[PDB]
């Protein structure tokens, strides 16, 4: 009668907050909705992804399938880890609800993947539109050198150049980069008036932003446009008031002003989470738990991945982030993308949402 769900996330190490947020978001879901579905108890089992390490995530998934007999897998912070698990799913008859990894093609790697996070194209196409609206003419792109960074670079170049913008520099930064000073010097030298950047949220984003400020680019009038990965709320106090004014596009802000988001923050606090630790992976986990409960109801708690996936395709609901749906073609969450600016409101640094771009699909797949 117990159905287990195996959640793989960054539970320890440099990215620990992001995996802790999967547990926070699932705990919030359970605080509201309970742990019973279709006459079964649902139990979430957590395993630690740690870092980009495909073989490790493959092995964790296989252990969860064999030893824990999970009916569903979920989580996956890093793209390469999600890619390692994807080819297992159909033979194992276990769906995977991706709660972060954001490279567009992940959903194409199995019929049994559904994604409740975001894609890089989805958030980057609005960033390029806003860059043009804000008067940028020459942009330097700097992205981490792996799947989602390459998607962000491609999306920004294509969209910005179609708007008449020029990309004057494009740097793919190794994931291991910790000293960002030389990159900042290269950007200065390029004469770009704006930077567009993505790095995975965690130490790389903190380092990049601090170098952008401390090397004087921000005060020198080189504006920063990022995806929201680069300015996650728990790092705003670590950047401090020097981060005021940084622009980003993203599908979720802790400051989102809606009744559903206010209720979600209350549930996070009631499930045991702290507000200044809340990140985007919590909302992807909360919505991913909704989809898992729907799949269990649709299948009466029996393993039947074809019926489970069919039940979530086309589903529409109001998330804490805004109105969302699962596109049946891509199995990716269609959602608003917001333009935000780092602001201080009632003594707190937040990403204030200034503009909405409604109902964005995964632009990386939508024109195929
Ligand atoms: Na597809």
Packed helices 259-270 and 280-298: angle between N→C axes, nearest 10 degrees: 90
79 φ, ψ (degrees, to nearest 5): -50, -50
- Bridge partners (DSSP) listed for residue 195: 140, 224
CA of 102 to the centre of ligand 1 (A): 14
Over the Cα atoms of the chain, what is R_g? 20
CA of 193 to the centre of ligand 1 (A): 36
H-state helical runs in the chain: 16-33, 54-66, 79-85, 89-92, 120-133, 147-162, 181-190, 203-214, 236-239, 259-270, 280-298, 305-312, 363-366
Closest by alpha carbon to 227, among 51, 319, 351, 363?
A: 351
CA of 186 to the centre of ligand 1 (A): 38
CA of 271 to the centre of ligand 1 (A): 35
DSSP string, 98-165: ESS---GGGGGG-TTEEESS--HHHHHHHHHHHHHHTT--EEEEEEESSHHHHHHHHHHHHHHHHTT-
CA of 366 to the centre of ligand 1 (A): 8
Task: For the chain, give every domain's residue range.
Answer: 1-118+257-335, 119-256+336-368
- Bridge partners (DSSP) listed for residue 140: 169, 195
CA of 332 to the centre of ligand 1 (A): 9
Query: What is the distance in angstroms between the CA of the first residue and the CA of the last residue of the chain?
Result: 43
DSSP state letter for 229: G
CA of 334 to the centre of ligand 1 (A): 13
At 239, list the tokens: 């950047």
Largest separation between any pair of C-alpha atoms in the chain = 64
Residue 157 contacts residue 135 (beta carbons within 8 Å)? no
DSSP state letter for 233: G
CA distance 179 to 215: 12
CA distance 321 to 335: 8
**Burial tier of 324 (Cβ tally within 10 Å: 0-12, 13-18, 19+):** buried
Give the method of determination. X-ray
Packed helices 305-312 and 280-298: angle between N→C axes, nearest 10 degrees: 120
CA of 330 to the centre of ligand 1 (A): 4
CA of 310 to the centre of ligand 1 (A): 14
Closest by alpha carbon to 65, among 83, 89, 43, 42?
A: 89
Q: What's CA 22's distance to the chain center, in Å?
A: 11
CA distance 85 to 57: 7
Residue 168 contacts residue 192 (beta carbons within 8 Å)? yes
Q: Please state which CATH number belongs to domain 119-256+336-368.
A: 3.40.50.2300
Residue 44 half-sphere exposure, CB side, CA atoms within 13 Å? 24
Q: Which residues contact 83 (CB under 8 A, 6 or more apart)?
A: 54, 101, 103, 106, 109, 147
- CATH 3.40.50.2300 for the 1-118+257-335 domain, yes or no: yes
CA distance 191 to 268: 44
CA of 314 to the centre of ligand 1 (A): 14
Resolution of this entry, Å: 1.3
Cα distances from 187 to residues 54, 158, 234, 338, in angstroms, run 32, 20, 27, 26
Packed helices 16-33 and 259-270: angle between N→C axes, nearest 10 degrees: 100
CA of 107 to the centre of ligand 1 (A): 7
SS3 300: coil
- Bridge partners (DSSP) listed for residue 42: 3
């Amino acid at each position: 009668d117990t159905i287990k769900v195996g959640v793989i996330g960054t539970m320890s190490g440099p990215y620990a907050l992001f995996g802790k947020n999967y547990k926070m978001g699932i705990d919030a879901w359970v605080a509201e909705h309970g742990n019973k579905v279709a006459g079964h108890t649902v139990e979430f089992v957590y395993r630690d992804e740690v870092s980009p390490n495909p073989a490790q995530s493959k092995a964790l998934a296989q252990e969860l399938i064999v030893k824990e007999k999970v009916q569903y897998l979920a989580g996956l912070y890093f793209t390469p880890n999600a890619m390692a698990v994807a080819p297992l799913l159909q033979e194992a008859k276990v769906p995977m609800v991706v709660m972060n990894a954001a490279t567009s093609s992940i959903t194409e790697k199995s019929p049994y993947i559904v994604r409740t996070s975001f894609t890089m194209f989805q958030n980057t196409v609005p960033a390029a539109k806003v860059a043009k609206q804000k008067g940028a003419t020459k942009v330097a792109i700097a992205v981490s050198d792996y799947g989602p960074g390459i998607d962000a670079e491609t999306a920004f170049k294509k969209t910005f150049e179609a708007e008449g913008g020029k990309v004057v520099e494009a740097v793919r930064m190794p994931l291991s980069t910790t000293d960002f000073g030389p990159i900042m010097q290269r950007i200065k030298n390029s004469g770009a008036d704006m930077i567009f950047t993505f790095l995975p949220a965690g130490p790389p984003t903190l380092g990049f932003v601090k170098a952008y400020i401390d090397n004087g680019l921000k005060a020198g009038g080189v504006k920063l446009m990022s995806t929201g990965d680069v300015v996650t709320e728990p790092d705003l106090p670590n950047i401090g008031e020097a981060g005021l004014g940084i622009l980003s596009t993203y599908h979720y802000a802790v400051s989102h002003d809606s009744p559903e988001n206010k209720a979600f923050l209350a549930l996070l606090q009631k499930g045991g989470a702290k507000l200044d630790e809340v990140t985007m992976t919590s909302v992807a986990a909360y919505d991913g738990a909704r989809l898992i409960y729907k799949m269990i109801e649709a299948t009466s708690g029996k393993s039947d991945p074809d019926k489970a996936i069919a039940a979530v395709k086309g589903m529409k609901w109001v998330s804490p982030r805004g109105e969302v749906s699962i596109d049946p073609e891509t199995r990716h969450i269609t959602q608003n993308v917001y333009l935000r600016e780092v602001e201080k409101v009632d003594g707190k640094l937040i990403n204030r949402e200034l503009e909405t771009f409604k109902a964005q699909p995964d632009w990386g797949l939508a024109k195929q």
